[PDB]
Amino acid sequence: TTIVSVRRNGQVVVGGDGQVSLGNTVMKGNARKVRRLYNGKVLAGFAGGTADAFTLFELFERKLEMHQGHLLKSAVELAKDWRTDRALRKLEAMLIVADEKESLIITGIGDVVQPEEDQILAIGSGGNYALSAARALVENTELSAHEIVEKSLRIAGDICVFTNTNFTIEELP
Amino acid sequence: TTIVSVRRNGQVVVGGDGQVSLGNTVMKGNARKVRRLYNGKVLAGFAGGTADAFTLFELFERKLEMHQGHLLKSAVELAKDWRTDRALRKLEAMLIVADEKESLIITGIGDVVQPEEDQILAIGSGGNYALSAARALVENTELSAHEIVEKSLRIAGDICVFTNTNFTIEELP
Amino acid sequence: TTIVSVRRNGQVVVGGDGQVSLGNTVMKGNARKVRRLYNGKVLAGFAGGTADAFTLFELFERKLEMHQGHLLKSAVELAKDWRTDRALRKLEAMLIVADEKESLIITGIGDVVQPEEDQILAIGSGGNYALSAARALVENTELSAHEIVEKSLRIAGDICVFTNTNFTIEELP
Amino acid sequence: TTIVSVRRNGQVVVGGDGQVSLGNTVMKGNARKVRRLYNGKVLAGFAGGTADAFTLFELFERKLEMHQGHLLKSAVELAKDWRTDRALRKLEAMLIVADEKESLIITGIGDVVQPEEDQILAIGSGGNYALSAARALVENTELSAHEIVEKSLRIAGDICVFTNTNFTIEELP
Amino acid sequence: TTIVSVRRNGQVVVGGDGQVSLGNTVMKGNARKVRRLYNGKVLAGFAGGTADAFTLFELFERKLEMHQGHLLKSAVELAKDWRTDRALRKLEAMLIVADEKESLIITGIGDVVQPEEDQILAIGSGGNYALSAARALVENTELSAHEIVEKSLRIAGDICVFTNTNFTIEELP
Amino acid sequence: TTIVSVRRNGQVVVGGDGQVSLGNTVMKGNARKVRRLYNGKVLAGFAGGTADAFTLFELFERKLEMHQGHLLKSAVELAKDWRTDRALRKLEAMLIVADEKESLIITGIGDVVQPEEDQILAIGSGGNYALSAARALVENTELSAHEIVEKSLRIAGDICVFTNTNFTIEELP
Amino acid sequence: TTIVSVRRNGQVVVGGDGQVSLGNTVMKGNARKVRRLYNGKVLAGFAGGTADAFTLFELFERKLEMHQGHLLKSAVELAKDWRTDRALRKLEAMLIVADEKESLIITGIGDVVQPEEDQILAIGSGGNYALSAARALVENTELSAHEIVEKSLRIAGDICVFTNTNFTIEELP
Amino acid sequence: TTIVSVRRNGQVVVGGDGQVSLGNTVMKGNARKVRRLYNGKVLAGFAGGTADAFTLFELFERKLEMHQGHLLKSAVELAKDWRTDRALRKLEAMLIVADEKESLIITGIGDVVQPEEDQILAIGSGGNYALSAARALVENTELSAHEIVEKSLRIAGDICVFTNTNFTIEELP
Amino acid sequence: TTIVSVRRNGQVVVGGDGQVSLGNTVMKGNARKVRRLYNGKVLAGFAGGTADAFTLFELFERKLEMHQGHLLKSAVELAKDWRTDRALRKLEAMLIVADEKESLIITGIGDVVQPEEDQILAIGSGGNYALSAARALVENTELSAHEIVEKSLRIAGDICVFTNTNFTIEELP
Amino acid sequence: TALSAADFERILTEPHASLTEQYKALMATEGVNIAFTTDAVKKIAEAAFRVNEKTENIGARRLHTVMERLMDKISFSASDMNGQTVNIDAAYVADALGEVVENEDLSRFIL
């Protein structure tokens, strides 16, 4: 997939295309890759092959609706469930989560990562392509975080063969 | 195998050939790949090597005859049995299930996928060949969902070396 | 790529997408994979690796030039420069060539192949997809050659992650 | 492919299917894998890769031309162009050749092989299948050469995923 | 190995050679591969490397002498012991079982397969060779199911390098 | 490496980093991967293995010398020395060449490629990063060619572990 | 990463760069690789891919705030948790820990290593490069342990492609 | 190793060399490979790399001194401990056991094999060499089972590079 | 490592170098590879990668300080902890243990080996080199077991790239 | 057998101490009379059935949870409305509970 998240002017956007790839064929091309969590309080975009990509999503929910939607705490509470003696399996996927306050990237291996100063996050095969266009724009244009996510996603769909121009974008507030 | 499902005019058809392949040899060529579930309320076609292909079938039954035949719910209840802490093994197979209401594709890895706007589903080695002929027909002909499944299956038996022209088709109502 | 050719009603059409893909990224999207040879009286579409595809094409051209454009003889003459003692050099590329009278598929290890009765030919990773879609339309509609080509090409670009939708179609009055 | 030959009652028959398979897909189904050489006085059936199969055949022909069509001598002469200092180039293809007097099986690395007592020869992925079925019929019925060929071929097309049922049989008065 | 079973005229025969292979060497060449079960009510032939091949045999016995020798039910009761949540290991072997009523083939992976219309079953490396000679005979001769198994086994020992002409045949009634 | 080229406002710029990396270590950081050819009227930047990159470059130069510096003809002439009977020898390197009139990308197996409409070209491990960044800037700002090159180069040196930030940029008045 | 620790004149310094690498791309470049433990009593630098690298860090903390910050004892208490009958998983990472008293290197495989006479420690891909510059300096200059760690880290960022010049250094007291 | 056992004239001998091989080096060359069991009632020779080779030995003892030294029963009781639901690990080794009554070969995979009519058994890399000389002798000489084992072992030490002429032989009564 | 042990004139020496190798680099070069056990009653030298090498050491201690320092019994009590139903993991290492009475070599796979007549033991990559020099000396010189171990260790440090001339030797009494 | 729409209509009155009677009496003690018209019994049986075929089929016990939502408005302020005959008909039952469509299953965990 390509999942990217930009944050500019009290705006937090999170977009992603909609191509479910199986081998080098395309099985579904509309798929919603960015979903809403905690009654609409947090944004989550996933990447990494359905199954794991999903069970990682669920596990972060059972942690938000058990910590009052405190993103950062929910994140770490989840991460710690991997860094123990008795591991929590291992997930072939990663998430980009963000609410009005913070934005993160959580891997099903048990680690939480905070963005770099510019506050831009991308994941998936088309990842860095979007992240390159994003930084390009954020640092040289006035465009809103939505316009940028929109623009960056397309740039990435035209280079990644596992990313299409059929995307779903969500923003906060 | 080649398993395809078309839905046109309150019609839901699900077909599949009948070739059990072992290596590059053919062991059985009549095999019924599309079976009926819940007293004839739902259609299920499988693909993915006997054993797992079957145990996936059974597991979806024990979920239907425990949820009043609610396809979607039965599907998700089954998927969730993989997305937990203690996994449910992992099956090398997938199913195409459909009743009068909805139609789905469930993988033994723990994911449920809904068709794309045209409501066409195919799985197995000969999968995309049938899906290509199906979309071709649905979008350019008046043929019934049965005629199409019938036609699409043959087109795929003549291209896939693991699919024959000996198929079994089931429809609802 | 995906190159397909349908011949119906004294019409011969050869169409193909335009996606040059390096690895899993996309370098060019407007590539012309179908071109006219011997004073526009013969069509050629090529799949396989770029360079070889080209040399394989440039080779058939020189042959065409030396034989008054006899498609069939030129094909054989060229095949015969591989089927001998002193090899020519295996080329990883196939061509689909056609003129008013014949449709042929030539490969880079020398061997010319004629279509089956239906007179439909397709090559490339997304070949069989176009081939399936094409056989379906030719057998169940009165659509012109051109339309069937155009239609199948898309049906395939939608399944192959290496085939896009920017087509280049050529027909032979 | 599957190519088999039975010789019984002053009759020599060589038959084979017509499935050209590229990978696990099927490109052509009406292929003629058995042809007549030297003024129709000798039968040739070929298995292996297409191109090589053809060059190995075209080579045996030139030999037959230079040796008044002596099947046995031509085979040896040809084999001797591999069994020397200056290699000819290993071909991945075998031929089953036969004329009024002899039945032989020639390979692409040069080595002629004679049948065992029963005078039955078979080559191709579905070779042994045809071979088994043929040995059974020759040893337990009065069926003509032609019938046994026809029968075995099918028994084999039914087991080999690379052999179809479209046969091309040639007998020698 | 080569294990074959023919059924003609209320006759159920089950033969198999006696070569225990280790690497490309022969360790024992008399081995009984077809045994009797349930006081002589059912025939069982195995293939697949001693150990597993045996524990599969035993597991089908503990199921017969616990279901009144009901072949089909015993089979499925056994198969279901693999298709559950908690698997039953996995066996590298398969069995051909048959009584006066039915005949089957059970794999230690958890699947039961019924013959095709002709009622002929073969397993093991020499499998298809026997199956080819069997079908050849059954469909073209009057020979008894015993004579056929006998004949088919030899045809297969002369082609498979892991099969000898030292076999043990059992029949019912 | 990362080599990118933007053409905008009668200006053509070719720029690239300077990191020669041997394995996962770094040998030189101030390498000049872009140089001037044919009396400084044409720019050339090269990615791929060092030596090959150089021979590929020195080759195009000889060609440029023999054809009055016609960028387009020289490229083709050079390509044609691979696209023939007597191979030239596959070179693991690509060049981006540009003069007042054209921008082109030439590879070591012979094949000249033109840019897409936007007139942007990039090669090297860090290619697509520069490419994404560049497309973004060209489509959303009035930045000069030079600036966009400089800008994208960095955005890519920041993502690619093989591209550093020591640039060498050349523009064509 | 590149993590190095020098000890000179009652000084204990521990530096490390800040590059989180994913494949051959750079995901985060500011990351703090050297953290403080036990209220600021001990220094810890890690290397070995986030997850494990972290859980190794935590496990050494739960052992310090359970042994009064006795480095050596905490170390061994941790190591012994791997050298038992029931292992403690296995971590793909290693730590350099040091307080006013001692300095160590603990691997998530269960072993503790003491420096060599010069009291210099380095770990990570950029390891030996820093360790080489460090020894070079310590043995031939008067520079403070901080200046040395600072200087040695840069030398290693300019050779390792997985190490940058963006580091974080901590010292005691 | 090379372990061979011959039985002639109420005599049961069991020999084996004494070379413990590690890689392609020899670690110990006197090792006793044939031991005595049940107060001297049964002979046991092992092969298959120390550890497993040994634990297989002990397990057959705890079964003899729990079944009154009934070889055959002790064998099967042991074999059955592998053919159950809950396996008994898996041993990389095999034993040749023999008392005045019977002689066997038991593998740590769970199978028991009886000799062929001549009553000769061999195991280990040098296995078949000894078995070849043994059969040679038994069938063409009058030599005692001891003389033969002795002679056969040497023939095998001179061909196997993992077998020496330093052997230990045991016989019954 | 290179660990060697010679025994001459009521003398038991056990030497080993001190090079801890990581990949093809040297991490620590003073390491004590020969340690003392049971208040100084037994000598132990290990080889096989820290971790396992160590836990194998500890497990032999918990067995000596539980059997009154009876080397041979402690050895076998430890070996038997691997040869059971429920294994004791598996260690990638081996030990050379010796007291005034006996000397042994214990592997973490579960086996105990006694020296050959000359009473010389060596283990590790540099093993056989020392063992070669040792036997050379013992059999042709009067040198003490200490002088020999000393000499043999150096001979092996100059041939093994994982062995140095920085060793630690221990002797009894 | 399972209980249909019609079967839920009868179980609501015919049985001794049926829910129609139990509430007629438990609300008569408050001094209030209540009429359960027939066109309103259908909309309670074929409204408790609609819920058993879109959730767990708890059976007849579904009627109790439905009634308790219907006799929710009355049960509270029944004392403060002494001596009144309230007509519970199709119009009342309809706008007494509301509507009950399936959860959200899909859009939540399915791609």
Swiss-Prot record, chains A, B, C, D, E, F, G, H, I:
Q: How is its activity regulated?
A: Allosterically activated by HslU binding.
InterPro entries referenced in this protein's UniProt entry, alphabetically:
ATP-dep_Prtase_HsIV_su, Ntn_hydrolases_N, Proteasome_sua/b, Proteasome_suB-type
Q: Which residues cross the membrane?
A: none
Checking Pfam families in the record gives: Proteasome
Listed CDD domains: protease_HslV
Location in or out of the cell: Cytoplasm
Q: Which domain of life is it from?
A: Bacteria
Q: What are the EC numbers?
A: 3.4.25.2
> Could you say which enzyme class this protein belongs to?
hydrolase
Q: Which GO terms describe its molecular function?
A: metal ion binding; threonine-type endopeptidase activity
Catalytic residues, per the record, are T1
User: Sorted alphabetically, which Gene3D superfamilies does this protein's record hold?
Assistant: Glutamine Phosphoribosylpyrophosphate, subunit 1, domain 1
Q: Which UniProt keywords apply?
A: Allosteric enzyme, Cytoplasm, Hydrolase, Metal-binding, Protease, Sodium, Threonine protease
The protein's assembly and partners:
A double ring-shaped homohexamer of HslV is capped on each side by a ring-shaped HslU homohexamer. The assembly of the HslU/HslV complex is dependent on binding of ATP.
Q: Which family does it belong to?
A: Belongs to the peptidase T1B family. HslV subfamily.
Matching entries from PANTHER family are given as: ATP-DEPENDENT PROTEASE SUBUNIT HSLV, METALLOPROTEASE TLDD
Would you tell me the protein name for this molecule? Answer: ATP-dependent protease subunit HslV
Species this protein is from: Haemophilus influenzae (strain ATCC 51907 / DSM 11121 / KW20 / Rd)
Give the taxonomic lineage as stored in the record: Bacteria, Pseudomonadati, Pseudomonadota, Gammaproteobacteria, Pasteurellales
Swiss-Prot record, chain J:
Binding, ATP? R61
Subcellular location per the Swiss-Prot or TrEMBL entry: Cytoplasm
Give the protein's biological function: ATPase subunit of a proteasome-like degradation complex; this subunit has chaperone activity. The binding of ATP and its subsequent hydrolysis by HslU are essential for unfolding of protein substrates subsequently hydrolyzed by HslV. HslU recognizes the N-terminal part of its protein substrates and unfolds these before they are guided to HslV for hydrolysis.
Its assembly, as annotated, is: A double ring-shaped homohexamer of HslV is capped on each side by a ring-shaped HslU homohexamer. The assembly of the HslU/HslV complex is dependent on binding of ATP.
Question: Which family, according to the similarity comment?
Answer: Belongs to the ClpX chaperone family. HslU subfamily.
Could you identify this protein by its name?
ATP-dependent protease ATPase subunit HslU
State which stretch of the full-length protein is shown.
Answer: 334 to 444 of 444
